[PDB]
Amino acid sequence: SITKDQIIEAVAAMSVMDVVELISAMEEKFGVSAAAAVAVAAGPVEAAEEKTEFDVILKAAGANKVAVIKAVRGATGLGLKEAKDLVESAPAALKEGVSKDDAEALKKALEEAGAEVEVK
Amino acid sequence: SITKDQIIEAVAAMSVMDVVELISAMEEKFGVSAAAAVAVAAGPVEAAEEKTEFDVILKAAGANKVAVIKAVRGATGLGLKEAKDLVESAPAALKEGVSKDDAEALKKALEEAGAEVEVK
């Protein structure tokens, strides 16, 4: 009685592992596998980390929305509109995880114009 | 005598169709065919469309068919001849649905040579 049904209850008789091995077996035997795999995804790490991830937030454009808008699109490159809305939607994050030098560069720019910036 | 291997030779004992039923049985039984749908294609069609599909047409090569021919084959890679005929068959579409940056890149190139281009 080597029916197909009996084979069904057979797989439901063994452990998942046994099922993995089986499937894996046939896969090779009948050669019905896309032996290749693809996904790409990972993220290594190790002591001795750097500190060049500063976030520049914009609190108040101040009485110089003009210069600000410039600094914005200038630091990013978003459409005039997008930039406008951004500022108009204050507070708004200008940059995230950028080099300190860059952060302070724009920061000083905001100050020169007379705007309120946030560094975190 | 229900070994993993014995099962392998079992699948190679029946027809493909009969096997399809086998595999199918388990699929339904263990219901191992219904675990949400993370994604597959991911590309719906809704408002908020982009504008990066510009067409660069060539109207007149001008008094610089040489430079033009270069720009042509350079932007495409068609045989010297093909390119020649193309230009000689003006007007001729250079590119279709290409990035604006690219469109303007060749455009400026044509201008540098002194040719008439069309952007649509």
Side-chain angles (χ1 to χ4, degrees):
Chain A
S1 293
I2 316 179
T3 55
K4 268 136 284 136
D5 277 274
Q6 92 89 1
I7 286 160
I8 305 298
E9 68 175 65
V11 160
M14 304 144 163
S15 25
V16 179
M17 269 157 175
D18 188 287
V19 179
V20 163
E21 282 163 76
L22 183 283
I23 288 301
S24 272
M26 290 171 60
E27 266 184 290
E28 181 161 310
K29 176 76 243 288
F30 290 92
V32 173
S33 194
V38 67
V40 175
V45 71
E46 239 97 40
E49 284 177 293
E50 257 277 41
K51 186 158 177 68
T52 51
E53 292 178 307
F54 282 75
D55 297 10
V56 181
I57 290 153
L58 165 152
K59 295 198 293 204
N64 208 329
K65 220 189 289 105
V66 169
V68 167
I69 284 159
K70 285 189 227 185
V72 175
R73 61 101 159 279
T76 60
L78 293 159
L80 205 66
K81 187 185 84 175
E82 284 270 44
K84 177 168 165 69
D85 300 312
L86 183 145
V87 170
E88 284 184 325
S89 71
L94 265 166
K95 323 185 85 185
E96 300 187 47
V98 291
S99 60
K100 187 260 186 184
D101 295 274
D102 283 344
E104 201 192 271
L106 198 65
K107 197 218 84 222
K108 71 153 181 80
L110 276 270
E111 291 191 296
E112 284 277 302
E116 194 73 74
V117 185
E118 169 168 49
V119 182
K120 71 91 154 281
Chain B
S1 294
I2 319 189
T3 56
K4 276 171 281 135
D5 279 55
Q6 268 151 11
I7 290 157
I8 301 182
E9 299 217 77
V11 167
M14 303 136 185
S15 24
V16 172
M17 269 281 184
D18 216 5
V19 164
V20 161
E21 283 170 273
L22 195 300
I23 279 69
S24 274
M26 287 195 214
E27 274 187 321
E28 197 194 310
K29 175 80 209 194
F30 295 102
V32 60
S33 304
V38 173
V40 171
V45 173
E46 241 245 48
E49 285 177 293
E50 257 277 41
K51 185 157 176 68
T52 51
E53 293 178 307
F54 282 76
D55 298 10
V56 181
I57 291 154
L58 166 152
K59 295 198 293 204
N64 208 329
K65 220 189 290 105
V66 169
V68 167
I69 284 160
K70 285 189 228 185
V72 175
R73 60 101 159 280
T76 60
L78 293 158
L80 205 66
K81 186 185 84 176
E82 283 270 44
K84 177 169 166 69
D85 300 312
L86 183 145
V87 170
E88 285 183 325
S89 71
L94 264 166
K95 323 186 85 185
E96 300 187 48
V98 292
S99 60
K100 186 260 185 184
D101 296 273
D102 283 344
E104 201 192 90
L106 198 65
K107 196 218 84 221
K108 71 153 181 79
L110 276 271
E111 290 190 296
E112 284 276 301
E116 194 74 75
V117 185
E118 169 168 50
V119 182
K120 72 90 155 281

